[PDB]
């Protein structure tokens, strides 16, 4: 159990991290689903003016 | 240096940053049954990682008036994981055990637990001539509690219990106890469902106390069988 | 890199990057779980490994999760972190996860 | 520390550990170093000769793809009474998000750029004309044409490429031309000696102007002509990887952000929500 | 490459050198396996 | 052993008894500009001790609702001591930086600060297409604060900010962070008044908390330029 | 000489005095997973005798109008003995199989059974576009029966099924068939509960017939996993 | 047992046989082995030096043919008010029976796949437009375009091939890309951890999605455009041959069968009937 | 093959190795010519 004295906060935080080890391998490149656009970005058309 | 420790067996690992060295019962270490000591002639199965790994039992709460707890081996694990399956499907078993008892608190808490591994701890009943019954002895994963820890529930004494392999968990000093147990028996193997080689006893000789914020202080037991071997295969009991 | 484990309604911004644990009243308490597909949306998606992996379709290799306890020095405790290979439903009790 | 890696690392079998003073699974995130705990130290492993290659993640391959950087449609007709049969494009790699996000995974980049130009036409039916186009490279803020037929197109020194719609897409390589040793994907500064300059825009990182015109005089009818430009970096060197973009892009001139209206990728929550930290999404219900 | 300028050549996908430690362990004093970090 | 540290440059020195090793950005170390990488042909001035020393900036207060702070380099020091004078009198400058962030509290306090050195930290503005202005970027010695630390004020994320040279100040563990920064740029030297090579960011990922006596908990930044070189001498700007 | 045979694995043994040599699928023999073909990095458990032994399934009755029977592996054994336990507790498994089909009658009886081991026997459904369901495929220890043995229930043909490892039990000649199966898959290991490497099919191409006393003529299947290995330990599914 | 065979085996002359204990023509089918009786042992043979080659039956050649795997016709026009100038195809080799039956003669197959794309057009007459098409490879269940002009076509990382109808068919090779050592032509299992998944469909064996669009904006009139995709496996390795398909195929998702209405290839009779077992079809009537 | 990836090469029609016995005679004990099989 988490055990703390009266003057310590009785609710504490954990920060979790993750990473790949060097036995990792990735294959078959594809476009990332994490970014996309519906219209021209602001200023894009001004590059033609 | 002798206060930090990592134990790794199979797919399990445990670390402690507040240990007190660790005990090897009678200065021995677990090992597989040699040919010159073997009796059962069938080829044994040695599961290795599926059974020689840490099994954590349900925790218990250390209270101001607690008398102590006990867990018998292999009974406590006879129904847990692949160790439990091998035990149920085989007439004979053999193994050592790596015991790790855990209990942390606060630098404002005090208390001392005797953590002792008792070989052949034959319990006695109090104030009656009737011998203890099956249900008084076989508690399984839950374990039991001491009625009269002062005499180890067997008419002897906890005072001299230090003659058995042990460590202590003195809150101001450490937060865990570790004991390595070799196979302990008069026979090379045994029937796991009717005989317990060792009994893990955790007894608060000095009660839990503090004047700071009151919190539930648990005691947790993790046990890893070592060098497991099973013979006499059949159906599950 | 940091996993967004607390991806829940009511958790805003950086509150989503930390998991709070409290002093418990009961024993063997489940604190949190984490879905593991580094190729789908969840706590692992916006990480270095998650972001780059999502520019690909196939992956192989071991992953490592490191947790840093950020309570006070006077705070103590023991936790058990379990990885359960696929096959069934996510364990909800320590006796099961511990296997 | 540096070495040649052609495959993922092998795994060595490991035994039981019970050593005092040795705690490989414990680390100290505060140091800034990533955990060095090896699988062999966390669990009992077997020996594995790993033959998995690592070449598809080489930076050269990761960025080595022809990505769309410009798309422009205009009317090819008699403009007696808007892009009048030609247009000018200040080259930039910030208009299309797929290429932009990948380049922005790095702080500095050095590379040569292969440019491919694809042209398509549509009648505003009697067939599609096989027009000749001219793409002239005009340096930074340099003099660009103002008419489909101005003298500027004589291209005495500027490089010009003439191609037909019926030919394969035009292609050529622009060398790494930065005045520095590498392009600045990000620039925490102001491009001028005064205080009113633009922030985050280092002129040194603008490859230049691309002026494209239809060489043919207008036909009796009008057509819509679309020119697509693709860029593929090669002979790449990259430095200092960065946190990937999460919020949708807003402008090509800055990193301004707003976030989606609702998660995922909202300013308040990047990852979509689950009911609680003990709720397992996609839990197997057998 | 039949062109006279080397920058016109095809891609160079043969640089397998790596040094992850500049990102994973940029600490001045190397961390030994198993030993307490602090 | 890796928890105590003394940094000494010029007439300045700093010690910490609760460090966590220290970071050398990208495994590099500052150095003077070699002849084979030089561009400006005038003989440079290398002030050494008058500029390569620790400059301590005004402290900031870590509050329960703080979002984080940042200081851009060399801007933060462009008006401090002899480093500031050389910067004002020369068109070109070059240097590395030794960064030491300080924050102590109590064994009853909790909190975690991410201390990261970001190269070319180009800020973005929130909910507008208008780019940040000169005064939004050049804060000088006072530094600025994060509006949305969650996305590093640039539409990315603090979660992946660990890809940059960094350390953490986790109160129960350490009370200082140290990062050594080499010259980081695409050019051998630069005009110090319009471009910032690095941005020091200190962000509380885990907020400050305690149940003991409440006190003002400051965060202090000390920065020492390293291997300073200046070219293009003229009058002060 | 090639008509008598004894198979012994673990605590089990089988003899036949009317065999017909025996088949080694594709001329191969079972073996443990070598390091140069391994993928899962955890140390595997190799139970040996507790799993590599003969498991006899419930018999079936050969009738004058029977169409044939089939048993999928490992499904048929996923809930039998220690092999079943290891399968339930581990995400990954790997093994070969020693198959022995038994059927005796009388010198006055006639009949011929095709005993074939089909790799990846993906069943098809009859006269519908709907794919077979989970319960149509996973029959477990009981196995299933053929609806249209003529086309092997997959739109092909039993006539050409001899292209697969097989033997026949022609009553006037032999009373048993034996086939040794090596691990057959495109991956070094697999999840045992959702994929069956082999399908044992026993089909009466020539129906059972006689004019002597009518008796129940059973067909019995005994299967022994070989070189079992399990990885990915967890709780039982 | 293994050896190099480049021609059919020769025949050796044989003499009269009358040996006790030697019966080469007798065998035991029950063992599962095919008869080993040689011609020389069954009859008196002469010597024959056989020079017949065996290369046309090499697996590489048997499967090494570009076979049609996809055929899609759609309308190219203004879709203001169905495949709107583009389509998406989940790659599979089960739609056209000739290729399917051959691949299904094997259990496992490892090969690289040469893809050839043929395009034809027809007016719905004033001539045929030389359109530019884009074929983008989008991985398994990955994000596909929803409009002829969506941003997805910028193809920042996905491989895209742009080709004209007037050019020879487009062509490229997709490597053996299975996550396993070989593709599973047949899969006796379920692709998911739950029980409701699809039977016989291992996702690992789906090469991916092919998204094809006409790049040109629509013309004033409509056209019918048909795209045909051919696949040729090469660098082939094959394992465990299987019984050939006899019943007509019913679905691309399974091996379900029904059979023809009448023989041949009816569920009840694969071979066509003859009057009796003593009736010789095509008997020579001299 | 002028491409950098070997899988892009033309077909490989030169593997004349064969072992029919894995299909024709997968019996553990070899069958001798002329001798009674059983
Ligand atoms: C398509 C499918 O198989 N299932 C759909 C559910 O996933 C979907 O529920 C939402 O799924 C979201 C997925 O997260 C991403 C993603 O595609 O991985 C995260 C990307 O970074 C994000 N990209 C951008 C540029 O914002 C992307 C995008 O927002 C969506 O594709 C647009 O819809 O989403 C996420 O987990 C959500 O929190 C979750 O609710 C449901 C919704 O009804 O539909 C299913 O078909
Ligand atoms: C074309 C010719 O020279 N003679 C014709 C006769 O053969 C035909 O009588 C029928 O012939 C059938 C032939 O068997 C196959 C074949 O073509 O070899 C067997 C194939 O597997 C089958 N294919 C499929 C996909 O089902 C194929 C097919 O059914 C037919 O081509 C379709 O008609 O037939 C078979 O032996 C029949 O049993 C037999 O009656 C007569 C019929 O009038 O016409 C002759 O011209």
DSSP character string of D13-80: ----EEEET--TT---GGGSPPP---HHHHS-B--B----B-GGGSHHHHH-S-EEEEEEEEEES---
SS3 content of chain H, % helix, strand, coil (to 5): 10, 30, 60
Residues D226, F230 contacting (CB under 8 angstroms) = no
CA D263 to ligand 1: nearest atom = 38
C9: helix, strand or coil: coil
H vs G contact (3+ beta-carbon pairs below 8 A): yes
Question: Residue F232's Cα: distance from chain center in Å?
Answer: 25
Residues B208, B217 contacting (CB under 8 angstroms) = yes
d(CA G201, CA G182): 17
Residue H161: partners with Cβ closer than 8 Å, 6 or more residues away: H117, H134, H135, H170, H172
Burial class, G125, CB count within 10 angstroms (exposed 0-12 / middle 13-18 / buried 19+): buried
Is any atom of ligand 1 closer than 6 Å to the C-beta of A35? Answer: yes
Which DSSP helix (H) or strand (E) runs through C20?
A: strand C19-22
Residue D272 CB neighbours (<10 A): 17
Residues F205, F87 contacting (CB under 8 angstroms) = no
Q: Whose CA is nearest to atom 6 of ligand 1?
A: C41
Q: Does C28 touch chain D (CB under 8 A)?
A: no
Which DSSP helix (H) or strand (E) runs through B88?
A: helix B81-89
Q: Which of B92, B70, B34, B37 is nearest to B229 (CA)?
A: B92
Q: Whose CA is nearest to atom 19 of ligand 2?
A: H264
Residue B15 CB neighbours (<10 A): 17
d(CA G200, CA G69): 8
Range list of β-strands (E), chain A:
11-20, 25-27
Instruction: Return the residues preceding each gap in chain I, C–N over 2.5 A, or none.
Output: none
Is any atom of ligand 1 closer than 6 Å to the C-beta of C41? Answer: yes
Residues D76, D121 contacting (CB under 8 angstroms) = yes
Residues F22, F199 contacting (CB under 8 angstroms) = no
Q: Whose CA is nearest to atom 38 of ligand 2?
A: H272
| Count of helix runs (H) and strand runs (E) in chain H | 3, 10
d(CA G234, CA G90): 6
Residue B129: partners with Cβ closer than 8 Å, 6 or more residues away: none
Closest ligand to the CA of H101: 2
How many Å is the Cα radius of gyration of chain E?
A: 20
Q: Which of B229, B195, B224 is nearest to B55 (CA)?
A: B224
d(CA D48, CA B99): 31
**What is the 3-class SS of B174-212, one letter each residue?**
CCEEEEEECCCCCCCCECCCCCCCEEEEEEEEEEEECCC
G102: helix, strand or coil: strand
Beta partners for D229?
Answer: D70, D117
Estimate the crossing angle of helix G81-89 against helix B81-89, to 10 degrees.
Answer: 180
The reply to whether residue C42 touches residue D281, judged by beta carbons under 8 angstroms, is yes
Query: How far does residue G15's CA lie from ligand 1's centre (Å)?
Result: 61
Specify the DSSP class assigned to residue F225: E
User: Structure tokens of H26?
Assistant: 């007798």
Domain segments of chain H: what residues? 1-286
Is any atom of ligand 1 closer than 6 Å to the C-beta of D274? Answer: no
Please give the tally of structural domains in chain I. Answer: 1
Instruction: Dump the DSSP string for B213-235.
Output: ----EEEEEEEEEEEEEEEEE-S
- What are residue H40's phi and psi, to 5 degrees? -60, -25
The reply to whether residue C21 touches residue A11, judged by beta carbons under 8 angstroms, is yes
Which DSSP helix (H) or strand (E) runs through C63?
A: strand C63-69
Closest ligand to the CA of D272: 1
- How many residues appear in chain B? 237
Write the residue in D23, D43, D44 that is nearest to B15 by C-beta.
D23
The reply to whether residue C62 touches residue G193, judged by beta carbons under 8 angstroms, is no
Residues H257, G151 contacting (CB under 8 angstroms) = yes
Residue D161 CB neighbours (<10 A): 16
The CA-based diameter of chain C, rounded to the nearest angstrom, is 46
Q: How many pairs of residues across G and H have Cβ atoms under 8 Å apart?
A: 157
End-to-end CA distance of chain I: 55
Specify the DSSP class assigned to residue D4: E
Q: Which of H127, E27, C29 is nearest to A2 (CA)?
A: C29
Identify the residue whose tokens are 């040649």.
D4
Using CA atoms of B169, B171, B175, B178 in order, give the dihedral in degrees to the nearest 10. -10
The reply to whether residue D22 touches residue B10, judged by beta carbons under 8 angstroms, is no
Identify the residue whose tokens are 């998995």.
D52
Query: Is the previous residue joined to D46 through a cis bond, with omega within 30 degrees of 0?
Result: no
The reply to whether residue H157 touches residue A28, judged by beta carbons under 8 angstroms, is no
Specify the DSSP class assigned to residue G159: T
Q: Whose CA is nearest to atom 38 of ligand 1?
A: D272
I21: helix, strand or coil: helix
D128: helix, strand or coil: coil
The reply to whether residue H194 touches residue D284, judged by beta carbons under 8 angstroms, is yes
Query: How far does residue H276's CA lie from ligand 2's centre (Å)?
Result: 18
Residues D72, D204 contacting (CB under 8 angstroms) = no
Residues F224, F7 contacting (CB under 8 angstroms) = yes
User: Structure tokens of H176?
Assistant: 């053996």
Identify the residue whose tokens are 């985050």.
D200
Instruction: Dump the DSSP string for B16-60.
Output: ESS----EEGGG----PPPTTT----SPPB--GGGTSS-EEPPPE
Which long-range contacts does I14-18 make (Cβ < 8 Å, 24+ apart)? I15/H58, I15/H60, I16/H4, I16/H5, I16/H6, I16/H54, I16/H55, I16/H58, I17/H2, I17/H3, I17/H4, I17/H5, I18/H2, I18/H3, I18/H4, I18/H5
How far does the CA of residue D214 sit from the closest CA of chain C (Å)?
A: 38
Question: Which letter, b or e, does each residue of H78-116 get, where b requires 16 or more Cβ atoms within 10 Å of its Cβ?
Answer: eeeeebbbbbbbebbbbebeebbebbbbbbbbbbbbbbb
Top residue of H18, H29, H34 to mutate, by most chain I CBs within 10 Å, is H34
Query: How far does residue C3's CA lie from ligand 1's centre (Å)?
Result: 18
Using CA atoms of H246, H252, H257, H261 in order, give the dihedral in degrees to the nearest 10. -80
Residues B4, D23 contacting (CB under 8 angstroms) = yes
Query: Is the previous residue joined to H27 through a cis bond, with omega within 30 degrees of 0?
Result: no
Top residue of F106, F160, F174, F212 to mutate, by most chain C CBs within 10 Å, is F160
User: Structure tokens of C78?
Assistant: 């023991």
Instruction: Dump the DSSP string for B153-177.
Output: TTTS-STTGGGSSEEEEETTT-SEE
Residues H259, H267 contacting (CB under 8 angstroms) = yes
Query: How far does residue H262's CA lie from ligand 2's centre (Å)?
Result: 11
Q: Which of H27, I37, H25, H22 is nearest to G1 (CA)?
A: I37
Closest ligand to the CA of H261: 2
User: Structure tokens of F130?
Assistant: 């208008």
Q: Does C94 touch chain B (CB under 8 A)?
A: yes
Q: Does A45 touch chain D (CB under 8 A)?
A: no
Burial class, G161, CB count within 10 angstroms (exposed 0-12 / middle 13-18 / buried 19+): buried
F-chain residues near E22 (CB < 8 A) = 26-28
Instruction: Return the residues preceding each gap in chain B, C–N over 2.5 A, or none.
Output: none
Residue H59 CB neighbours (<10 A): 18
Name residues 2-21 of chain A within 8 A of B (Cβ).
3-6, 10
Who lines ligand 2 at CB under 6 A? H 260, 263-265, 272
User: Structure tokens of G179?
Assistant: 């086939």
Residues G19, G178 contacting (CB under 8 angstroms) = yes
How far does the CA of residue A28 sit from the closest CA of chain F (Å)?
A: 23
CA angle F127, F130, F135 (to 5 degrees): 105
Residues F75, F61 contacting (CB under 8 angstroms) = no
Residues D286, C89 contacting (CB under 8 angstroms) = yes
How many Å is the Cα radius of gyration of chain I?
A: 20
Residues H157, A36 contacting (CB under 8 angstroms) = no
Chains near H with 3+ CB pairs less than 8 A apart are: A, C, D, G, I
Q: Can you give the residue range of the structural domain that contains I14?
A: 1-38
How far does the CA of residue H231 sit from the closest CA of chain A (Å)?
A: 19
Instruction: Dump the DSSP string for D218-242.
Output: PPSS-EEEEEEEEEEEEEEEEEEE-
CA angle E34, F2, F7 (to 5 degrees): 155
Question: Residue G197's Cα: distance from chain center in Å?
Answer: 10
d(CA H250, CA H257): 6
Query: How far does residue A33's CA lie from ligand 1's centre (Å)?
Result: 9
d(CA B8, CA D23): 10
The reply to whether residue C91 touches residue G235, judged by beta carbons under 8 angstroms, is yes
Is any atom of ligand 1 closer than 6 Å to the C-beta of A28? Answer: no
d(CA H119, CA D243): 43
Burial class, D102, CB count within 10 angstroms (exposed 0-12 / middle 13-18 / buried 19+): buried
d(CA B153, CA D48): 52
d(CA F70, CA F67): 10
Question: Residue G111's Cα: distance from chain center in Å?
Answer: 21
Residues G113, G103 contacting (CB under 8 angstroms) = yes
Residues G78, G192 contacting (CB under 8 angstroms) = yes
Write the residue in D8, D35, D52 that is nearest to C64 by C-beta.
D35
Using CA atoms of G160, G162, G168, G172 in order, give the dihedral in degrees to the nearest 10. 60
Burial class, B49, CB count within 10 angstroms (exposed 0-12 / middle 13-18 / buried 19+): buried
User: Structure tokens of D115?
Assistant: 């440019």
Q: Work out whether strand G176-181 and strand G23-24 pair parallel, antiparallel, or are unpaired.
A: parallel
Q: Which of D147, D122, D73, D117 is nearest to D210 (CA)?
A: D117
User: Structure tokens of B106?
Assistant: 């606060």
d(CA B184, CA B30): 10
d(CA C97, CA C89): 11
CA angle F69, F74, F75 (to 5 degrees): 65
Question: Which letter, b or e, does each residue of H126-143 get, where b requires 16 or more Cβ atoms within 10 Å of its Cβ?
Answer: eeebbbbbbbbbbbbebb
Q: Work out whether strand D106-123 and strand D183-184 pair parallel, antiparallel, or are unpaired.
A: antiparallel
Instruction: Return the residues preceding each gap in chain C, C–N over 2.5 A, or none.
Output: none
Is any atom of ligand 1 closer than 6 Å to the C-beta of D263? Answer: yes
d(CA D242, CA F35): 31
Q: For residue C26, say whether it is annotated as part of any ligand binding site.
A: no
How far does the CA of residue A27 sit from the closest CA of chain B (Å)?
A: 28
The reply to whether residue A22 touches residue D11, judged by beta carbons under 8 angstroms, is no
- What are residue G235's phi and psi, to 5 degrees? -90, 165
User: Structure tokens of H46?
Assistant: 């002469």
d(CA H74, CA G95): 50
Residue D110 CB neighbours (<10 A): 17
The reply to whether residue I13 touches residue H31, judged by beta carbons under 8 angstroms, is no
- How many residues appear in chain G? 237
A-chain residues near H158 (CB < 8 A) = 29-31
Per the entry, the structure determination technique was X-ray
- Is the Cα torsion angle D70, D73, D76, D81 positive or negative in sign? negative
The class of domain F1-237 in CATH terms is mainly beta
CA angle C75, C76, C78 (to 5 degrees): 145
Burial class, G25, CB count within 10 angstroms (exposed 0-12 / middle 13-18 / buried 19+): buried
CA D272 to ligand 1: nearest atom = 38
Instruction: Dump the DSSP string for G18-42.
Output: S----EEGGG----PPPTTT----B
D97: helix, strand or coil: helix
Q: How many pairs of residues across C and G have Cβ atoms under 8 Å apart?
A: 29
Using CA atoms of B9, B10, B16, B22 in order, give the dihedral in degrees to the nearest 10. -10
Give, in order, the Cα–Cα distances in Å from G1 to each of B184, G19, I27, I37, I38. 50, 10, 14, 10, 8
The reply to whether residue G134 touches residue H195, judged by beta carbons under 8 angstroms, is yes
Burial class, F61, CB count within 10 angstroms (exposed 0-12 / middle 13-18 / buried 19+): exposed
d(CA F82, CA F224): 12
Residues B191, B91 contacting (CB under 8 angstroms) = yes
- Pocket mutation for ligand 2, best pick of H260, H264, H266 (most atoms within 8 Å of C-beta): H264
Write the residue in I21, I22, I38 that is nearest to G3 by C-beta.
I38
- What are residue H74's phi and psi, to 5 degrees? -150, 165
User: Structure tokens of G170?
Assistant: 């022609």
Is any atom of ligand 1 closer than 6 Å to the C-beta of D260? Answer: yes
Give, in order, the Cα–Cα distances in Å from D42 to each of D13, D16, G9. 12, 10, 35
d(CA F196, CA B120): 74
How far does the CA of residue F127 sit from the closest CA of chain A (Å)?
A: 13
In this structure, which topology does domain H1-286 adopt according to CATH?
Answer: Jelly Rolls (2.60.120)
Residues B118, B153 contacting (CB under 8 angstroms) = no
- Is the Cα torsion angle F188, F193, F196, F201 positive or negative in sign? positive
Which DSSP helix (H) or strand (E) runs through C69?
A: strand C63-69
- What are residue F171's phi and psi, to 5 degrees? -40, -40
The reply to whether residue G20 touches residue H28, judged by beta carbons under 8 angstroms, is yes
Which DSSP helix (H) or strand (E) runs through F96?
A: strand F90-102
The reply to whether residue G131 touches residue H253, judged by beta carbons under 8 angstroms, is yes
d(CA F179, CA D30): 12
Find, in chain C, the residue whose alpha carbon is nearest to that of B49: C99
């Amino acid at each position: 159990n988490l055990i703390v004295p009266s003057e310590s906060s009785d609710t504490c935080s954990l920060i979790g991290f993750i990473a790949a080890k060097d036995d990792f391998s990735l294959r078959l490149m594809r476009d990332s689903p994490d970014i996309g656009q519906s219209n021209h970005l602001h200023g894009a058309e001004a590059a033609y003016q | 240096s002798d206060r930090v420790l990592q134990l790794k067996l199979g797919n399990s690992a445990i670390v402690t940053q507040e240990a007190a060295n660790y005990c090897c019962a009678y200065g021995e270490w677990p090992n597989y049954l040699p040919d010159h000591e073997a009796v059962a002639i069938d080829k044994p199965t040695q599961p290795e990682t599926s059974t020689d790994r840490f099994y954590t039992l349900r925790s218990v709460k250390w209270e101001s008036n607690s008398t102590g707890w006990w867990w018998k081996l292999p009974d406590a694990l006879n129904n847990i994981g692949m160790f439990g399956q091998n035990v149920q499907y085989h007439y004979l078993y053999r193994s050592g055990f790596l015991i790790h008892v855990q209990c942390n608190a606060t630098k404002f808490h005090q208390g001392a637990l005797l953590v002792v591994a008792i070989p052949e701890h034959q319990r006695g009943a109090h104030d009656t001539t009737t011998s203890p019954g099956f249900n008084d002895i076989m508690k399984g994963e839950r374990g039991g509690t001491f009625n009269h820890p002062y005499v180890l529930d067997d008419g002897t004494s906890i005072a001299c219990a230090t003659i058995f392999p042990h460590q202590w968990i003195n809150l101001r000093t450490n937060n865990s106890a570790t004991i390595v147990l070799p196979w302990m028996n008069v026979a090379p193997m045994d029937f796991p469902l009717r005989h317990n080689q060792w009994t893990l006893a955790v007894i608060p000789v000095v009660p839990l106390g503090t004047r700071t914020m009151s919190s539930v202080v648990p005691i947790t037991v993790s046990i890893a069988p070592m060098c497991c071997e099973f013979n006499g295969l059949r159906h599950a009991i | 890199s940091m996993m967004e484990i607390n991806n829940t309604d009511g958790a805003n911004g950086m509150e989503r990057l930390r998991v709070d644990i409290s002093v418990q009243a009961d024993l063997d308490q489940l604190l949190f779980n984490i879905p593991l597909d580094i190729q789908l949306d969840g706590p692992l998606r916006n990480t270095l490994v998650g972001n780059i992996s999502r520019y690909y379709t196939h992956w192989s290799g071991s992953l490592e999760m490191t947790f840093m306890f950020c309570g006070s020095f006077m705070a103590t405790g023991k936790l058990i972190l379990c990885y359960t290979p696929p096959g069934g439903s996510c364990p909800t009790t320590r006796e099961t996860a511990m296997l | 520390v540096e070495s040649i890696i052609k495959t993922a690392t092998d795994t060595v079998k490991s035994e039981i550990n019970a050593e005092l003073g040795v705690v490989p699974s414990l680390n100290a995130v505060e140091t800034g170093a990533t955990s060095n705990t090896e699988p062999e130290e966390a669990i009992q492993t077997r020996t594995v000769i790993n033959q998995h290659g690592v070449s598809e993640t080489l930076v050269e391959n990761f960025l080595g793809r022809a990505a769309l950087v410009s798309k422009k449609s205009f009317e090819y007709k008699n403009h007696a009474s808007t892009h009048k049969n030609f247009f000018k494009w200040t080259i930039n790699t910030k208009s299309f998000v797929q290429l932009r996000r990948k380049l922005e995974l790095f702080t500095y980049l050095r590379f040569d750029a292969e440019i491919t130009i694809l042209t398509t036409v549509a009648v505003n039916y009697m067939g599609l004309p096989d027009l000749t186009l001219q793409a002239m490279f005009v340096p930074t803020g340099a003099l660009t044409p103002k008419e489909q037929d101005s003298f500027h197109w004589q291209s005495g020194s500027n490089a010009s490429v003439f191609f037909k719609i019926s030919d394969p897409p035009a292609r050529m390589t622009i060398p790494f031309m930065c005045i520095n040793s590498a392009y600045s994907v990000f620039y925490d500064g102001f491009a001028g000696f005064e205080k009113n300059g633009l922030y985050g825009i280092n002129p040194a990182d603008t490859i230049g102007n691309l002026c494209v015109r239809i060489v043919n005089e207008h036909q009796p009818v009008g057509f819509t002509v679309t020119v697509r430009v693709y860029m593929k970096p090669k002979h790449i060197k990259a430095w200092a990887p960065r946190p990937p973009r999460t919020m949708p892009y807003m402008s090509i001139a800055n990193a301004n952000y707003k976030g989606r209206d609702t998660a995922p990728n909202t300013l308040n929550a990047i990852i979509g929500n689950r009911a609680s930290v003990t709720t397992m999404p996609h839990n197997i219900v057998t | 490459n039949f062109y006279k300028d080397s920058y016109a050549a095809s891609a160079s996908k043969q640089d397998f050198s790596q040094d992850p430690s500049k990102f994973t362990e940029p600490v001045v004093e190397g961390l030994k396996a198993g030993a307490p970090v602090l």
